[PDB]
Design an enzyme around this catalytic site. Structure first.
Site, PDB file in Angstrom:
ATOM      1  N   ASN A  79      24.751  33.291  34.750  1.00  0.00           N
ATOM      2  CA  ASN A  79      25.895  34.001  34.232  1.00  0.00           C
ATOM      3  C   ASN A  79      26.132  33.462  32.827  1.00  0.00           C
ATOM      4  OD1 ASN A  79      28.279  35.396  33.914  1.00  0.00           O
ATOM      5  ND2 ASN A  79      29.458  34.148  35.354  1.00  0.00           N
ATOM      6  N   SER A 135      32.873  45.144  40.834  1.00  0.00           N
ATOM      7  CA  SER A 135      31.608  45.188  40.113  1.00  0.00           C
ATOM      8  C   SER A 135      31.775  45.599  38.660  1.00  0.00           C
ATOM      9  CB  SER A 135      30.650  46.157  40.802  1.00  0.00           C
ATOM     10  OG  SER A 135      29.519  46.444  39.990  1.00  0.00           O
ATOM     11  N   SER A 136      31.242  44.799  37.742  1.00  0.00           N
ATOM     12  CA  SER A 136      31.065  45.229  36.347  1.00  0.00           C
ATOM     13  C   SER A 136      29.633  45.631  35.900  1.00  0.00           C
ATOM     14  CB  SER A 136      31.693  44.234  35.363  1.00  0.00           C
ATOM     15  OG  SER A 136      30.982  43.010  35.361  1.00  0.00           O
ATOM     16  N   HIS A 141      22.527  43.101  41.726  1.00  0.00           N
ATOM     17  CA  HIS A 141      22.537  41.668  41.545  1.00  0.00           C
ATOM     18  C   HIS A 141      23.400  41.035  42.602  1.00  0.00           C
ATOM     19  CE1 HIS A 141      26.081  43.137  39.565  1.00  0.00           C
ATOM     20  NE2 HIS A 141      26.454  41.976  39.063  1.00  0.00           N
ATOM     21  N   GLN A 143      25.366  37.243  43.658  1.00  0.00           N
ATOM     22  CA  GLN A 143      25.955  36.150  42.917  1.00  0.00           C
ATOM     23  C   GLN A 143      25.960  34.864  43.744  1.00  0.00           C
ATOM     24  OE1 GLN A 143      29.088  39.153  40.702  1.00  0.00           O
ATOM     25  NE2 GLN A 143      28.910  37.056  39.956  1.00  0.00           N
TER      26      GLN A 143
HETATM   27  N1  LIG Z   1      24.316  39.372  29.297  1.00  0.00           N
HETATM   28  C1  LIG Z   1      24.580  38.800  30.481  1.00  0.00           C
HETATM   29  N2  LIG Z   1      23.729  37.925  31.072  1.00  0.00           N
HETATM   30  C2  LIG Z   1      23.988  37.346  32.265  1.00  0.00           C
HETATM   31  N3  LIG Z   1      25.114  37.593  32.949  1.00  0.00           N
HETATM   32  C3  LIG Z   1      26.046  38.452  32.453  1.00  0.00           C
HETATM   33  C4  LIG Z   1      25.836  39.125  31.169  1.00  0.00           C
HETATM   34  N4  LIG Z   1      26.907  39.907  30.939  1.00  0.00           N
HETATM   35  C5  LIG Z   1      27.742  39.756  31.999  1.00  0.00           C
HETATM   36  N5  LIG Z   1      27.212  38.896  32.888  1.00  0.00           N
HETATM   37  C6  LIG Z   1      27.731  38.432  34.166  1.00  0.00           C
HETATM   38  O1  LIG Z   1      27.361  39.351  35.166  1.00  0.00           O
HETATM   39  C7  LIG Z   1      28.284  39.200  36.276  1.00  0.00           C
HETATM   40  C8  LIG Z   1      28.744  40.556  36.742  1.00  0.00           C
HETATM   41  O2  LIG Z   1      29.455  40.458  37.965  1.00  0.00           O
HETATM   42  P1  LIG Z   1      30.432  41.603  38.437  1.00  0.00           P
HETATM   43  O3  LIG Z   1      31.352  41.962  37.308  1.00  0.00           O
HETATM   44  O4  LIG Z   1      31.042  41.225  39.762  1.00  0.00           O
HETATM   45  O5  LIG Z   1      29.461  42.720  38.660  1.00  0.00           O
HETATM   46  C9  LIG Z   1      29.397  38.270  35.768  1.00  0.00           C
HETATM   47  O6  LIG Z   1      29.114  36.932  36.178  1.00  0.00           O
HETATM   48  C10 LIG Z   1      29.240  38.362  34.259  1.00  0.00           C
HETATM   49  O7  LIG Z   1      29.763  37.264  33.550  1.00  0.00           O
HETATM   50  N1  LIG Z   2      37.101  33.754  41.862  1.00  0.00           N
HETATM   51  C1  LIG Z   2      36.372  33.373  40.790  1.00  0.00           C
HETATM   52  N2  LIG Z   2      36.228  32.077  40.462  1.00  0.00           N
HETATM   53  C2  LIG Z   2      35.509  31.678  39.396  1.00  0.00           C
HETATM   54  N3  LIG Z   2      34.874  32.516  38.569  1.00  0.00           N
HETATM   55  C3  LIG Z   2      34.937  33.839  38.793  1.00  0.00           C
HETATM   56  C4  LIG Z   2      35.694  34.365  39.935  1.00  0.00           C
HETATM   57  N4  LIG Z   2      35.587  35.708  39.896  1.00  0.00           N
HETATM   58  C5  LIG Z   2      34.822  36.014  38.809  1.00  0.00           C
HETATM   59  N5  LIG Z   2      34.454  34.893  38.161  1.00  0.00           N
HETATM   60  C6  LIG Z   2      33.635  34.797  36.959  1.00  0.00           C
HETATM   61  O1  LIG Z   2      34.486  34.463  35.875  1.00  0.00           O
HETATM   62  C7  LIG Z   2      34.044  35.154  34.675  1.00  0.00           C
HETATM   63  C8  LIG Z   2      35.170  36.023  34.154  1.00  0.00           C
HETATM   64  O2  LIG Z   2      35.316  37.210  34.919  1.00  0.00           O
HETATM   65  P1  LIG Z   2      36.531  38.203  34.677  1.00  0.00           P
HETATM   66  O3  LIG Z   2      37.594  37.475  35.453  1.00  0.00           O
HETATM   67  O4  LIG Z   2      36.267  39.513  35.388  1.00  0.00           O
HETATM   68  O5  LIG Z   2      36.866  38.237  33.207  1.00  0.00           O
HETATM   69  C9  LIG Z   2      32.771  35.897  35.066  1.00  0.00           C
HETATM   70  O6  LIG Z   2      31.651  35.049  34.846  1.00  0.00           O
HETATM   71  C10 LIG Z   2      32.959  36.104  36.567  1.00  0.00           C
HETATM   72  O7  LIG Z   2      31.765  36.312  37.294  1.00  0.00           O
END
Ligand SMILES: Nc1ncnc2c1ncn2[C@@H]1O[C@H](COP(=O)(O)O)[C@@H](O)[C@H]1O
Ligand SMILES: Nc1ncnc2c1ncn2[C@@H]1O[C@H](COP(=O)(O)O)[C@@H](O)[C@H]1O
Length: 292
Positions: A79, A135-136, A141, A143
């Site tokens: 990540n 999901s973003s 994928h 995790q």
């Molecule tokens: N360029 C990147 N390379 C690797 N991980 C990424 C990238 N852009 C976003 N992510 C990660 O991909 C994950 C997406 O998880 P989610 O939003 O649950 O689908 C999050 O951990 C993001 O931080």
């Molecule tokens: N519960 C959680 N604890 C720690 N990290 C997380 C959690 N949920 C998402 N992340 C990660 O934190 C980063 C920020 O995600 P976001 O909160 O969607 O901006 C991304 O790398 C996520 O994959």
């Protein structure tokens, strides 16, 4: 078949990316909260900074392995924007869609990585599935992230004192009746020798039955969490919570792991941790269990 000393390679790999910028670690502070109504333990991480197809060709500085197993199905990426140091992506080599179900290979591959890293450390594996799952990214994928050192997710207590089972006419999946949200949990065999591809497939699809019924009476959305101790499937009606909190929630929040970007919210959860419960209700479906 997992690569050898896969921990080291993930560790070896992360310490670098951090140094050269190829990934950036958001600062956070985290605290435990307990739900006075439901007894559920909450791990609440505060990252105010966050208030401020990449898996196709990701920076190789970010690529732990080009094929996880002997198969050419999976890479392992870091990540690029970790809150928990070392959080890893299990990524399909040739693009598949995040809406797609998990396959016996996927679950065992991921389970074997659990077993690599776990050779008081503990790891969580999750999958956000659907528009509403949190999901973003559409490239399939999975995790993997460290869970908190001293923390007891409710799945544990619901799962201890209960030996592994595949649901028997006198038995359903395990479901905590205290909490607001529908969820489905099965215990796993303790030694990883009792665990294989066919067992998880059973577990997952089984769970997936009960899960699916939450649509046929929104495109199917849900979370899967997997730990060495159990597997859990959550059906998802929304990505972000309701009116008090307006929280974004993914698989982690359904073992009680919450990520908030502003202080007032942190305070309000602290003042009333049961709001977390109502939020998982808002992003979930009402609970069933205690019945058939
Ligand atoms: N360029 C990147 N390379 C690797 N991980 C990424 C990238 N852009 C976003 N992510 C990660 O991909 C994950 C997406 O998880 P989610 O939003 O649950 O689908 C999050 O951990 C993001 O931080
Ligand atoms: N519960 C959680 N604890 C720690 N990290 C997380 C959690 N949920 C998402 N992340 C990660 O934190 C980063 C920020 O995600 P976001 O909160 O969607 O901006 C991304 O790398 C996520 O994959």
């Amino acid at each position: 078949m997992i690569e050898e000393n896969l921990k080291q390679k993930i560790h070896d790999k992360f310490v670098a990316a951090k140094k050269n910028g190829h990934l950036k670690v958001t600062h956070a502070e985290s605290k435990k909260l307990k739900d006075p109504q439901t007894t559920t333990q909450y791990w609440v991480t505060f990252a105010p900074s966050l208030a401020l197809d990449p898996f196709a060709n990701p920076d190789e500085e970010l690529v732990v392995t080009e094929d996880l197993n002997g198969d050419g199905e999976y890479k392992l990426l870091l990540n690029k924007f970790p809150v928990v140091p070392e959080h890893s992506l299990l990524v399909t080599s040739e693009f598949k869609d995040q809406r797609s179900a998990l396959t016996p290979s996927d679950l065992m591959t991921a389970y074997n990585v659990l077993c690599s890293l776990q050779g008081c450390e503990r790891y969580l594996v999750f999958y956000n599935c659907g528009p509403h799952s949190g999901s973003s990214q559409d490239h399939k994928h999975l995790q993997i992230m460290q869970m908190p050192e001293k923390f007891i997710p409710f799945q544990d207590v619901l799962c201890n004192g209960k030996d592994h089972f595949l649901p028997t006419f006198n038995a359903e999946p395990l479901q905590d009746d205290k909490v607001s949200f529908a969820h489905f949990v099965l215990p796993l065999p303790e030694s990883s020798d009792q665990v294989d591809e066919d067992l998880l497939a059973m577990c997952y699809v089984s769970l997936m039955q009960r899960a699916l019924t939450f649509f046929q009476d929104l495109t199917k959305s849900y979370n899967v969490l997997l730990t060495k101790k159990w597997i859990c499937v959550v059906p998802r009606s929304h990505a972000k919570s309701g009116p008090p909190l307006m929280l974004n929630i993914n698989s982690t929040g359904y073992c009680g792991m919450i990520l908030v970007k502003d202080r007032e919210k942190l305070e309000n959860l602290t003042e009333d941790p049961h709001l977390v419960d109502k939020s998982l209700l808002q992003c979930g479906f009402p609970n069933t269990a205690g019945q058939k």
